[PDB]
């Protein structure tokens, strides 16, 4: 009777190199949990044919599947080529609180194995679980355990705590033709997402963050700013730092409302209005957050990952260079800044993705984690994520 | 304020 969606809601999916099994994992997990638990068992093809979706302004190929374990429900994400999962971790078009890395034992890591791990920190991906694959072609139990030892040492690279990282090994494809030994592996896999990945917090139960969008003034009442409470929840007799742009400034919620009716509190995901106290309009500015005191600081330079959107995904036709000092759109504003490459590159090419240090003309409130967009003159040709604020 | 459905709005 979970139709009313009950059972506590994980995102995980399956990264990993192309060919090591990640989409016949998918399949094999669905199909697997179906006839244990019941369910939506899915094949090969109809996950492979992934169809294409908008996350920010940028085309992503993402297939999505759902299923259920006796304790809990899980969305799980699975992409054909690797730019997807590269737009997919950057943008955060996917939720994930969780990643199947899958490596093909016969192959042992890849390139792919190593850049979706390292963008996987760089993102936030906070756990990651492993299923070496395609060990009905691999019997010689000693060459397993060397794959083994090469993958948690290259996660602890990566700063993911290698030691302690659930293997499995199986095999997804003999799993999806019923072989029965095979199948008890999906299951330990499943019983790994129960228990290793912790239940993920609530937009809901984080600190309060609003973006600020319009600011108007009510004759007597005070300044009211608008927009869409982005996580936790704003009660009224609170106090809210204003931050980012100008300098941080302290004020108290003294009024929620929504739709025109007024509220005792605003919560993550509503369109509310805040009525602060003893702050006067011009104070007050688009871009700025209401936020809970003592949780979000403004900064100006940070290390980012970022996605520069192709020539088809409407983007640049030619590369850029350094010197290129672009829009960088942080939730409800532009911010001009300067940029680094990385050490020897002196171009991006449309399509690429590199590590880039961003410098802003002024602070915006921000934190690991952070999506953006890069613009030029309100046309899209990037996105990225904030992955360590610098100063 | 002054959304209504679900439009940037409010009051306060
Ligand atoms: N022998 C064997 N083949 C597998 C296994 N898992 C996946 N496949 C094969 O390896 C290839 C890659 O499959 P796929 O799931 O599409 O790879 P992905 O690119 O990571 O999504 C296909 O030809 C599959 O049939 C396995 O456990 N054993
Ligand atoms: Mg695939
Ligand atoms: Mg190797």
Same mark, same amino acid.
């Not at chain 1, 996950?47 to 299923?67: C, F, L, M, Q, W």
């Not at chain 1, 003294?254 to 025109?260: A, I, K, L, N, S």
């Not at chain 1, 809970?292 to 940070?302: A, D, L, M, V």
């Given at each position: 009777?979970?139709?009313?969606?009950?059972?506590?809601?994980?995102?995980?999916?399956?990264?990993?190199?192309?060919?090591?099994?990640?989409?016949?994992?998918?399949?094999? *997990?669905?199909?697997?949990?179906?006839?244990? +638990?019941?369910?939506?068992?899915?094949?090969?093809?109809? *996950?492979? /044919?992934?169809? &294409?979706?908008?996350?920010?302004?940028?085309?992503? /190929?993402?297939?999505?599947?759902? +299923?259920?374990?006796?304790?809990?429900?899980?969305?799980?994400?699975?992409?054909?080529?690797?730019?997807?999962?590269?737009?997919?971790?950057?943008?955060?078009?996917?939720?994930?609180?969780?990643?199947?890395?899958?490596?093909?034992?016969?192959?042992?890591?890849?390139?792919?194995?190593?850049?979706?791990?390292?963008?996987? $920190?760089?993102? %936030?991906?906070?756990?990651?679980?492993?299923?070496?694959?395609?060990?009905?072609?691999?019997?010689?139990?000693?060459?397993?355990?060397?794959? &083994?030892? &090469?993958?948690?040492?290259?996660?602890?690279?990566?700063?993911?705590?290698?030691?302690?990282?659930?293997?499995?090994? %199986?095999?997804?494809?003999?799993?999806?033709? %019923?072989?029965?030994?095979?199948?008890?592996?999906?299951?330990?896999?499943?019983?790994?997402?129960?228990?290793?990945?912790?239940?993920?917090? $609530?937009?809901?139960?984080?600190?309060?963050?609003?973006?600020?969008?319009? @600011?108007?003034?009510?004759?007597?009442?005070?300044?009211?700013?608008?927009?869409? @409470?982005?996580?936790?929840?704003?009660? @009224?007799?609170?106090?809210?730092? *204003?931050?980012?742009?100008?300098?941080?400034?302290?004020?108290?919620?003294?009024?929620?409302?929504?739709?025109?009716?007024?509220?005792?509190?605003? $919560?993550?995901?509503?369109?509310?209005?805040?009525?602060?106290?003893?702050?006067?309009?011009?104070?007050?500015?688009?871009?700025?957050?209401?936020?809970?005191?003592?949780?979000?600081?403004?900064?100006?330079?940070?290390?980012?990952?970022? +996605?520069?959107?192709?020539?088809?995904?409407?983007?640049?036709?030619?590369?850029?260079?350094?010197? +290129?000092?672009?829009?960088?759109?942080?939730?409800?504003?532009?911010?001009?800044?300067?940029? &680094?490459?990385?050490?020897?590159?002196?171009?991006?090419?449309?399509?690429?993705?590199?590590?880039?240090? @961003?410098?802003?003309?002024?602070?915006?409130?921000?934190?690991?984690?952070? $999506?953006?967009? *890069?613009?030029?003159?309100?046309?899209?040709?990037?996105?990225?994520?904030?992955?360590?604020?610098?100063? | 304020? !002054?959304?209504?459905? !679900?439009?940037?709005?409010?009051?306060?």
């Amino acid at each position: 009777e979970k139709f009313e969606r009950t059972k506590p809601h994980v995102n995980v999916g399956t990264i990993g190199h192309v060919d090591h099994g990640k989409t016949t994992l998918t399949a094999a *997990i669905t199909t697997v949990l179906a006839k244990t +638990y019941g369910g939506a068992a899915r094949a090969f093809d109809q *996950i492979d /044919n992934a169809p &294409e979706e908008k996350a920010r302004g940028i085309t992503i /190929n993402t297939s999505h599947v759902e +299923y259920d374990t006796p304790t809990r429900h899980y969305a799980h994400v699975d992409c054909p080529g690797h730019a997807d999962y590269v737009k997919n971790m950057i943008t955060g078009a996917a939720q994930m609180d969780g990643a199947i890395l899958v490596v093909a034992a016969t192959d042992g890591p890849m390139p792919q194995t190593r850049e979706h791990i390292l963008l996987g $920190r760089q993102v %936030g991906v906070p756990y990651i679980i492993v299923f070496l694959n395609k060990c009905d072609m691999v019997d010689d139990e000693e060459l397993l355990e060397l794959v &083994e030892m &090469e993958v948690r040492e290259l996660l602890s690279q990566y700063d993911f705590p290698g030691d302690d990282t659930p293997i499995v090994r %199986g095999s997804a494809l003999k799993a999806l033709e %019923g072989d029965a030994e095979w199948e008890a592996k999906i299951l330990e896999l499943a019983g790994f997402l129960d228990s290793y990945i912790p239940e993920p917090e $609530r937009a809901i139960d984080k600190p309060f963050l609003l973006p600020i969008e319009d @600011v108007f003034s009510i004759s007597g009442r005070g300044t009211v700013v608008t927009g869409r @409470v982005e996580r936790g929840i704003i009660k @009224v007799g609170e106090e809210v730092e *204003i931050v980012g742009i100008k300098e941080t400034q302290k004020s108290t919620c003294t009024g929620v409302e929504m739709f025109r009716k007024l509220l005792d509190e605003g $919560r993550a995901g509503e369109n509310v209005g805040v009525l602060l106290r003893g702050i006067k309009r011009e104070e007050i500015e688009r871009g700025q957050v209401l936020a809970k005191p003592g949780t979000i600081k403004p900064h100006t330079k940070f290390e980012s990952e970022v +996605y520069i959107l192709s020539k088809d995904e409407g983007g640049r036709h030619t590369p850029f260079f350094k010197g +290129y000092r672009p829009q960088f759109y942080f939730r409800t504003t532009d911010v001009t800044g300067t940029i &680094e490459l990385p050490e020897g590159v002196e171009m991006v090419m449309p399509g690429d993705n590199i590590k880039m240090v @961003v410098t802003l003309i002024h602070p915006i409130a921000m934190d690991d984690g952070l $999506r953006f967009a *890069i613009r030029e003159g309100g046309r899209t040709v990037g996105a990225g994520v904030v992955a360590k604020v610098l100063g | 304020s !002054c959304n209504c459905f !679900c439009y940037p709005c409010c009051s306060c």
